[PDB]
Ligand binder design. Structure first.
Ligand code: TPP
Ligand code: TPP
Ligand code: MG
Ligand code: MG
Lengths: 802, 802
């Protein structure tokens, strides 16, 4: 247990704590301006001149003194209450507030021994911010206390709420930009309080950093009337409190006392809500939220060159852009830095004075040190059930290609028993699609957690106020809740209809970038569990929906995060349920990855045994010798290769026909896509030798690909024999139609694959047969048109091994 | 002017209109069930049997009878008030409601002459829904009355609001799913009422289709308390009204009268708001919104096999899935269809009776016929100013590579004069980034439209209650407002920081799919203006931000919509301002496209004259003969090729060094990326002959690419000489650093390009020089580290022609 969770003070905040908070605020404002402006001379020792100012002024002052003031008060709160706490910096461009926090709490020097607590360390701390060879502009993963960089705005609240799930002792004050609040993801984020339980989950306190402005505009929320603003948050299930400071001549000490008192009233109400939830965990309370309204750029000069800067969008980036170039800008910088009175905050050796930090929390309650902000320190391996009990044994008993199994059903039974073994640290998310993607075997041991109105057992099923599945119709919520759940040391999976995964393409990008920085250069930030995404209800079988739901191209996005041997991204094609089981075990064991697991949910053949899936997954691509009819590679007229359940089914049917014509070929299945890249681009891929062994040195290769052929063509550009691959993929053809028609219109059906194989071998010799196959595809289509269902010879085909 | 806009009735709704609305509701429910279930015998003529039921039951009943009831009342409203109206079907899976609407209003038969108004047409209308060779499951672009398919949920409100911009006579009732309302994009969509003006824009009426459920869960908004729900909409600036029906034994006629009365009160208030805005266009009113609460699946059987179906998520997809296979399901289907009493609604010939549609609007007020739902019918070419006046003439006067121009500034001056010439039909959108991306010359003739609080001329600048620029910190709002603005016949552009474009990747996918269906097979849906997206503040020069803001991969998404010679997608690299001008003119003239226009906003060289840009843009790729030093292609030791402003600058500097070493080469610039594809994949690309002419038959090609090298490798896979291209692209390396460092870490800087060129020509001979170049890159880096700015020999270089 960290600290003493949800304890009230029962006395006023001490005047000593008010004094330290003002000193914190002044020292973090001062060091924040130092990080932005100063390359040397951090204490302004004589001579202090323009030569000390950075040549390239980059950074964001505007948000920063607001963050610094909140951080003083959140630090004071943590310490007085001993409260386990992670904050979220929505406006992550306020990096200097976050580095200053860690430098003051002592974690910066603990993690970065060269940045010491004295004048030399402070000079280095100022210079390195946003500087070549130094550190980033934002609250990046390399800053102690970050689980959220806030570079791409919008995810503050899904992360805050994912962090408190199953984390009942954790408090998360979540600082949200008022511009950030104009984004879609942030706006739906407010509703998460219907999806957490105040007894079994922790508590988020949204703090709206209502500073009036974004980059070059006021914000929507700051300019609506106060009655609308309060109604809005009340309507989303919060008790709104509002603080206003900085707009008049109120002295700073008075402002600190009034905020501290307010913040104690808010926390008292959170403690009452927590105590009450021990007895009534079914009534959803109105959680407090804080409207925090202060001038943007607070404490900077009011006017610069006749333009209002404090209390304006003009404070957003870098005031006094000429600080190095004109004595006029320099003098204003100098008076601004002096207004904090650093001579009272730093000792002669340049260390921050003891009376500046005596109010701060210590040890693992420090914001930089808490293990929830470095969740790999808390993470334990899942207790995984034995995979063998889930195997589809129909392949072993009856033959390759047996049965009509819905593949994700085996993964659902497996996830069911993972939750049973790990009952408060593995969660499932779904955007109203968990049952639709066939993961509902999980409801045998848990419920969809819903903390909002109930009506009747006639409609409410597999749903309770507490449980380990969470659904909301929002891919942004699902992805963001899960990320933070992982970042705080836990595990899970979510599932999505495949074309809708693109809603969160840019979230996958940010979390891949977080992983990239971390695996490269932040070894103190320990491995977290991987994002595991079941990508199902795919392009080939969107039976109730249509062309709008046909887009497997998240493959292509993910290919753009496969650099530097980072190995943070995996694309897997689950050929059947036994391959799906083998992939899922690997993904559930992996760390520091995004794993995209493609699988069809339609009734389909099972091709491999589980032991075969385990060996084939490890190689990445495998020959299916029991399907090939060629002696060796020299005897091969064509390589039949596929990735995806549907392309595989169709290729396999094509191989059966080609066998029957006396064509010689081998069958290669591809599961781990990126293992096709060259060793030069991927030091864990197939060696050129294993790759030639699979695909031959010079025979034609027909490659039936689940997604866009572009992907495979780009990946194998420097592989031996690449000029002989003919990649057939999805080509933006389809509609609401039968399963044969969907593969037909993309030249993916067995008949078109058989034809392409013939074309590659001898187009002249096979002209007539190709014609007959093209004509059969028209007959099969007409049959679907006339009759309402696909031609039996298509639907009824089973691989000859069964 | 369409109809008589914003007129009140001043009498009750007639009892005749109530009677017709009930008949409409019954006939559209009946035909909706017919579309889902029946392959033949639409009037249930003896014998009516299971043989008449479809073999594959696909579709969505649940939302549909709610849509049908709203559509009856919206039709009644249009007719009584003669009100110019487009509706939005948020729950676009309710396609049958939308096809039924067009079939009843007469537009279906007008557009589809084979689907006639009689028993034969009705049989064909039922069979073709969601059927091979037939029509889609959703409210697709092929349905008259659609500007919004609603397949991917979330964009209902941005589209409704983009539609009414500059459209002061248009009324848009916007039907929103209660599950859809859980998405991020929908949730921020409610706030658009701060960004429209009630005098110069039209009016949206949000209607929340509060049916209690999404696919397999209740919805958040339906289960919160009524006080929270009303506070929420009041807080977002609406006057909420709430209608509740269907949960008890109230007779349908009474329900219609109570709704009609309510809907007249709402419209009266909209008319008062419109009249008032003629005098006070500065006070933002509280626009009505409608909470519409009715049972999901309304009018279907209450229980099926002991399970509650009406008033449940169970009504979502297809009730009675065994209708063809069991006499028990069949009998329930039969009684359900009979409950609408079709014998009263259809004549013996199968035509819909006159008393069913006498209340309907006529002519161009019909929902299927209104030209706003087919905006290409309204669209006119922009009055474009002459491009020559914007040219950067420094190239002509001083030489290729002259100056320090910020390229989008020329596009801003051009957009300024386009708004001046087309003052109410060209809009600019930006997610708080219009000025940041340098398009602010537009503010010389118009303002950012802001209909929310004002404070002071000290902070409010270039902002008024009416104007042709719209900003909100949300890429979803910007993209969705613009799409509908285009779909209703108008024009514009938006701009985005490049990595944040990925927020709306899935919106680009949907609009590309809308364009694909339209160019292929809906010739009555006339061309609309193109989406024009200035993609700037790019991966190479995100000076104040960092690794998080470094992602040029929307190129890769767009490559997945380049099929079938649809030609709906363009990727352009603006080499400089004069190329940007030539691209922009072309995009502003184009129709039926998404145009992604890449340009840097940093100070940069101008390479080509405007006349040169115009010729080079048309070819797609061009040799720069004045930069090449080789006689002919046989004399060429390496092809120096680039796409992007930054890669071009660095390649050019490399060419200067290579010239000075006596290396022979040609320089090729690439602007229209997809023109690199083969003719087989793109019938408008460079022919193999023009391509070989540019890139040679067999010399090595160094290709410096702005985005991920994957893209170019996949595109040129079947081109002559592709094996000799070495593509250098962005490789997930960078941080907050100097401009040289950013190109350095990706091997993109001039020195690394010079080295790669040498390596490709003779690695052995040039070993030492390569080493010296790699060492110079380290020295330049160290210099940035030590000094705070890049080495002058790097920054101060100007191409020798100046
Ligand atoms: C999704 C997204 N779009 C655009 C941006 C560009 N951007 C970086 S900061 C900023 C303004 C943020 O304003 P606000 O949230 O009010 O933060 P403040 O500095 O006022 O605290 C913008 C638009 C972004 N970071 N993320
Ligand atoms: C962005 C997105 N995610 C997921 C889906 C999958 N989906 C299609 S309909 C639906 C439920 C919609 O419920 P609601 O909006 O309440 O509409 P209803 O049928 O109740 O009117 C879902 C989740 C989608 N269409 N779009
Ligand atoms: Mg702000
Ligand atoms: Mg609903």
């Amino acid at each position: 247990v960290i600290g003493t969770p949800w304890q009230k003070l029962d006395r006023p905040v001490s005047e000593e704590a008010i004094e330290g908070m003002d000193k914190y605020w002044r020292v973090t404002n001062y060091m924040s301006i130092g990080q932005i402006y100063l390359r040397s001379n951090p204490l302004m020792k004589e001579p202090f001149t323009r030569d000390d100012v950075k040549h390239r002024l980059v950074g964001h002052w505007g948000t920063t003194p607001g963050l610094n003031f909140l951080l003083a008060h959140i630090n004071r709160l943590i310490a007085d209450h001993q409260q386990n706490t992670v904050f979220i910096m929505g406006p992550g461009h306020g990096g200097p507030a976050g580095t200053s926090q860690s430098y003051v709490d002592g974690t910066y020097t603990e993690y970065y021994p060269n940045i010491t607590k004295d004048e030399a360390g402070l000079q280095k701390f100022f210079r390195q911010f946003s500087y070549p060879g130094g550190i980033p502009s934002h609250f990046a993963p390399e800053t102690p206390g970050s689980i959220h960089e806030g570079g791409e705005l919008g995810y503050a609240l899904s992360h805050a709420y994912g962090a408190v799930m199953n984390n009942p002792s954790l408090f998360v004050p979540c600082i949200i930009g008022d511009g950030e609040a104009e984004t879609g993801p942030l706006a739906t984020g407010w509703q998460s309080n219907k999806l957490v339980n105040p007894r079994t989950d922790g508590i988020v306190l949204p703090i709206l950093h209502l500073n009036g402005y974004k980059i070059a505009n006021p914000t929507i929320l700051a300019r609506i009337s106060d009655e609308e603003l309060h109604d809005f948050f009340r309507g989303m299930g919060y008790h709104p409190y509002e603080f206003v400071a900085g707009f008049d001549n109120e002295d700073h000490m008075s402002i600190h006392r009034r905020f501290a008192e307010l913040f104690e009233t808010i926390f008292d109400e959170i403690c009452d809500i927590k105590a009450a939830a021990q007895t009534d965990d079914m009534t959803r309370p109105f959680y407090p939220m804080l409207i925090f309204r202060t001038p943007k750029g607070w404490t900077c000069p009011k006017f610069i060159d006749g333009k209002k800067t404090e209390g304006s969008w003009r404070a957003h980036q870098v005031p006094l852009a000429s600080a190095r170039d004109t004595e006029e800008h320099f003098e204003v910088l100098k008076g601004w830095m002096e207004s904090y009175k650093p001579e009272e905050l730093f000792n002669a050796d340049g260390s921050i004075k003891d009376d500046v930090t005596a109010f701060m929390p210590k040890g693992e309650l420090r914001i930089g040190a808490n293990p929830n902000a470095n969740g790999g320190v808390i993470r334990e391996d899942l207790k995984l059930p034995e995979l063998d009990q889930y195997e589809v044994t129909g392949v072993k008993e009856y033959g390759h290609g047996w049965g009509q199994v819905e593949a994700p059903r085996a993964l659902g039974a497996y996830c069911r028993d993972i939750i049973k073994n790990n009952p408060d640290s593995f969660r499932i998310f779904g955007p109203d699609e968990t049952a639709s993607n066939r993961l509902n075997a999980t409801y045998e041991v848990t419920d969809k957690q819903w903390d909002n109105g109930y009506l009747s057992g006639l409609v409410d099923e597999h749903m309770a106020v507490t449980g380990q599945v969470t659904e909301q119709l929002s891919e942004h919520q699902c992805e963001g809740f899960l990320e933070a759940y992982l970042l705080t040391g836990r595990h899970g999976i979510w599932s999505s209809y495949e074309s809708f995964v693109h809603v969160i393409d840019s979230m996958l990008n940010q979390h891949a970038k977080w992983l990239e920085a971390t695996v490269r250069e932040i070894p103190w930030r320990k491995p977290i569990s991987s994002v595991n995404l079941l990508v199902s209800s795919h392009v080939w079988r969107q039976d109730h929906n249509g062309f709008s739901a046909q887009d497997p191209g998240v493959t292509s996005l993910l290919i753009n995060k496969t650099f530097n041997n980072d190995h943070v991204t995996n694309i897997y094609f689950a050929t059947d349920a036994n391959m799906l089981l083998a992939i899922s075990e690997k993904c559930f064991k992996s760390t520091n990855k995004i794993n995209a697991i493609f699988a069809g949910k339609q009734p389909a053949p099972t091709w491999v045994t589980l032991d075969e899936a385990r060996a084939e997954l490890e190689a990445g691509a495998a020959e299916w010798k029991w399907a090939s009819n060629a002696e060796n590679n020299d005897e091969v007229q064509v390589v039949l290769a596929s990735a995806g359940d549907v392309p595989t089914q169709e290729l396999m049917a094509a191989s059966d026909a080609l066998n029957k014509m006396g064509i010689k070929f081998k069958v290669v299945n591809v599961v781990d896509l990126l293992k096709l890249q060259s060793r030069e681009n991927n030091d864990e891929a197939l060696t050129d030798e294993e790759f030639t062994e699979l695909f031959t040195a010079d025979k034609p290769v027909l490659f039936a690909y689940h997604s866009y052929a572009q992907d495979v063509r780009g990946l194998i550009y420097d592989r031996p024999n690449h000029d002989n691959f003919h990649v057939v993929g999805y080509k933006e053809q389809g509609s609401t139609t039968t399963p044969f028609d969907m593969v037909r219109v993309n030249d993916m059906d067995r008949y078109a694959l058989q034809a392409a194989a013939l074309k590659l071998i001898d187009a002249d010799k096979y002209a007539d047969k190709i014609d007959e196959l093209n004509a059969f595809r028209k007959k099969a289509f007409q049959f679907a048109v006339d009759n309402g269902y696909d031609i039996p010879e298509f639907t009824d085909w089973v691989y000859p091994d069964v």
